[PDB]
Enzyme design. Structure first.
Site, mmCIF file in Angstrom:
data_model
loop_
_atom_site.group_PDB
_atom_site.id
_atom_site.type_symbol
_atom_site.label_atom_id
_atom_site.label_comp_id
_atom_site.label_asym_id
_atom_site.label_seq_id
_atom_site.Cartn_x
_atom_site.Cartn_y
_atom_site.Cartn_z
ATOM 1 N N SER A 181 0.798 -8.415 6.240
ATOM 2 C CA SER A 181 0.842 -9.853 6.223
ATOM 3 C C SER A 181 0.034 -10.545 4.913
ATOM 4 O O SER A 181 -0.830 -9.885 4.480
ATOM 5 C CB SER A 181 -0.212 -10.210 7.482
ATOM 6 O OG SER A 181 0.533 -9.959 8.729
ATOM 7 N N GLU B 286 0.718 5.036 8.265
ATOM 8 C CA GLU B 286 0.114 5.480 9.805
ATOM 9 C C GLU B 286 1.315 6.433 10.128
ATOM 10 O O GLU B 286 2.356 5.957 10.040
ATOM 11 C CB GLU B 286 -0.052 4.384 10.475
ATOM 12 C CG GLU B 286 -1.040 3.547 9.867
ATOM 13 C CD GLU B 286 -1.312 1.971 10.630
ATOM 14 O OE1 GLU B 286 -0.751 1.871 11.825
ATOM 15 O OE2 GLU B 286 -1.915 0.966 10.264
ATOM 16 N N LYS C 197 0.947 -1.282 -0.010
ATOM 17 C CA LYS C 197 -0.130 0.016 -0.191
ATOM 18 C C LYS C 197 0.642 1.342 0.051
ATOM 19 O O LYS C 197 0.360 2.354 -0.563
ATOM 20 C CB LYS C 197 -0.939 -0.143 1.123
ATOM 21 C CG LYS C 197 -1.921 -1.269 1.346
ATOM 22 C CD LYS C 197 -3.009 -1.159 2.217
ATOM 23 C CE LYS C 197 -4.338 -2.034 2.203
ATOM 24 N NZ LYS C 197 -3.663 -3.658 2.086
HETATM 25 B B1 LP0 Z 1 -2.571 -5.966 4.980
HETATM 26 O O1 LP0 Z 1 -1.556 -6.988 4.898
HETATM 27 C C1 LP0 Z 1 -3.920 -6.808 4.712
HETATM 28 N N1 LP0 Z 1 -3.740 -8.066 4.946
HETATM 29 C C2 LP0 Z 1 -4.678 -8.834 4.205
HETATM 30 O O2 LP0 Z 1 -5.309 -8.685 3.101
HETATM 31 C C3 LP0 Z 1 -4.625 -10.438 4.835
HETATM 32 N N2 LP0 Z 1 -5.212 -10.648 5.942
HETATM 33 O O3 LP0 Z 1 -5.688 -9.740 6.440
HETATM 34 C C4 LP0 Z 1 -5.497 -9.877 7.867
HETATM 35 C C5 LP0 Z 1 -6.108 -11.103 8.390
HETATM 36 C C6 LP0 Z 1 -6.158 -8.637 8.578
HETATM 37 C C7 LP0 Z 1 -3.856 -10.119 8.441
HETATM 38 O O4 LP0 Z 1 -3.538 -9.181 9.420
HETATM 39 O O5 LP0 Z 1 -3.376 -10.850 7.739
HETATM 40 C C8 LP0 Z 1 -4.172 -11.296 3.767
HETATM 41 C C9 LP0 Z 1 -3.916 -12.476 4.105
HETATM 42 S S1 LP0 Z 1 -3.390 -13.467 2.625
HETATM 43 C C10 LP0 Z 1 -3.379 -12.093 1.672
HETATM 44 N N3 LP0 Z 1 -3.064 -12.044 0.303
HETATM 45 N N4 LP0 Z 1 -3.961 -10.996 2.556
HETATM 46 O O6 LP0 Z 1 -2.379 -5.236 6.233
HETATM 47 P P1 LP0 Z 1 -2.352 -5.752 7.421
HETATM 48 O O7 LP0 Z 1 -3.437 -5.206 8.482
HETATM 49 O O8 LP0 Z 1 -2.600 -7.242 7.619
HETATM 50 O O9 LP0 Z 1 -1.070 -5.421 8.267
#
Ligand code: LP0
Length: 356
Positions: free
Chosen positions: A312, A269, A64
């Site tokens: 993840s 963030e 992202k």
């Molecule tokens: B990012 O890495 C978003 N994530 C996602 O979409 C996933 N899962 O989710 C949960 C249960 C909430 C965790 O933590 O791992 C996946 C699985 S295999 C695929 N292709 N995708 O952000 P964060 O909140 O995780 O650091």
């Protein structure tokens, strides 16, 4: 002092391998433009292949941050405005309800009716178009944050349309080269599959991320520890990079709204620095990640900021954090998921023990 970084990472990260039965881990620290790479265990259990500077990991939601950077790049090249709506670029969404949501609201998860995932049944481009055509509002647009792959996914697709390139090419041909990334991929080529780690699920079975709807912009990037340290370097010290990507990076650092102590920037963030451990842990609480939360306008604009993002997939854990004021950052890559809390805490102890 420099000699202490390995010991701190051994003290705080290494024990997580035994604790969670993680086959392989790469932890990078960058301090005052010096990179430290710590490698542990195996990229492949079956192949007995060691994690090293060539090992490619799935970034999951840390993807992202590249989508956000691509958005900031498109904006500062005048290809999009964050005030624009998706129908302006994806014509088939023109004058549909989703066309009342602007690009910033899509990027920062405030459409007011988009969940974490697409429905399982949504797979094809046609099913994805149908999903957004049939979309209707629920909460007041711009007022409620719900962390959403579809939301930033649609933002990514629109950024790609604005640059007349498929999203994979936007990153691989424009953004990654601009950031000087050598081994960062949406699609890992045949020649690099030998360096692509297996992920391991909770049964320690080898797994890789499967194709999904708008996967690339939401969770679809793979990278090495050196590349991710370069990306953190760019976020700490943009001056060495082209004006276009400098502007793109600065765009991703701008807080857009607050949910208590967490400021939502573009992908990143953002927190007031110094942040308490519980502030950083709270950012990825069930309440914040899984539930809708009414946003406020930014009241306290922090003088000194830090930024983080977890990622993840089924087989991989990622954590990236940087503190501009301390000129320090950390990247953690694992080929097994460990709790977000452990990633955030380990990084907190290490970054607080170095800086001072
Ligand atoms: B990012 O890495 C978003 N994530 C996602 O979409 C996933 N899962 O989710 C949960 C249960 C909430 C965790 O933590 O791992 C996946 C699985 S295999 C695929 N292709 N995708 O952000 P964060 O909140 O995780 O650091």
């Amino acid at each position: 002092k420099d000699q202490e970084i390995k010991k701190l990472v051994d003290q705080n990260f290494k024990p997580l391998l035994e604790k969670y039965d993680v086959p392989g881990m790469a932890v990078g620290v960058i301090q005052n433009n010096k990179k430290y790479e710590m490698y542990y265990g195996l990229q492949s259990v079956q192949d007995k292949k060691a994690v090293n500077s060539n090992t490619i990991f799935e970034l999951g939601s840390v993807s992202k941050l590249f989508t956000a950077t691509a958005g900031g790049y498109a904006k500062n090249k005048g290809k999009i405005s964050f005030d624009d709506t998706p129908g302006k670029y994806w014509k088939e969404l023109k004058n549909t309800p989703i066309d009342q949501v602007n690009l910033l609201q899509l990027a920062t998860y405030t459409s007011g009716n988009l969940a974490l995932q697409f429905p399982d049944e949504v797979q094809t481009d046609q099913q994805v178009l149908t999903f957004f055509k049939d979309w209707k509002p629920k909460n007041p647009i711009g007022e409620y944050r719900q962390y959403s792959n579809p939301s930033i996914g649609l933002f990514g697709k629109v950024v790609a349309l604005s640059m007349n390139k498929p999203f994979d090419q936007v990153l691989e041909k424009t953004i990654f080269p601009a950031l000087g990334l050598k081994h960062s991929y949406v699609n890992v080529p045949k020649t690099q599959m030998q360096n692509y780690a297996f992920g391991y699920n909770q049964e320690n079975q080898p797994i890789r991320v499967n194709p999904g709807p708008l996967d690339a912009p939401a969770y679809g990037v793979k990278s090495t520890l050196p590349d991710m340290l370069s990306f953190i370097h760019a976020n700490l010290n943009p001056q060495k990079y082209p004006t276009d990507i400098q502007r793109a990076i600065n765009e991703t650092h701008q807080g857009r709204y607050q949910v208590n102590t967490m400021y939502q920037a573009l992908g990143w963030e953002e927190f007031s620095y110094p942040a308490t451990l519980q502030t950083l842990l709270d950012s990825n609480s069930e309440q914040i990640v899984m539930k809708p939360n009414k946003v406020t306008a930014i009241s306290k604009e922090p003088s000194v900021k830090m930024y983080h993002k977890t990622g993840s997939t089924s087989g991989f854990g990622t954590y990236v954090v940087f503190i501009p004021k301390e000129n320090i950052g950390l990247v953690m890559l694992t080929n097994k998921r460990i709790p977000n809390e452990e990633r955030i805490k380990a990084a907190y102890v290490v970054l607080n023990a170095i800086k001072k």
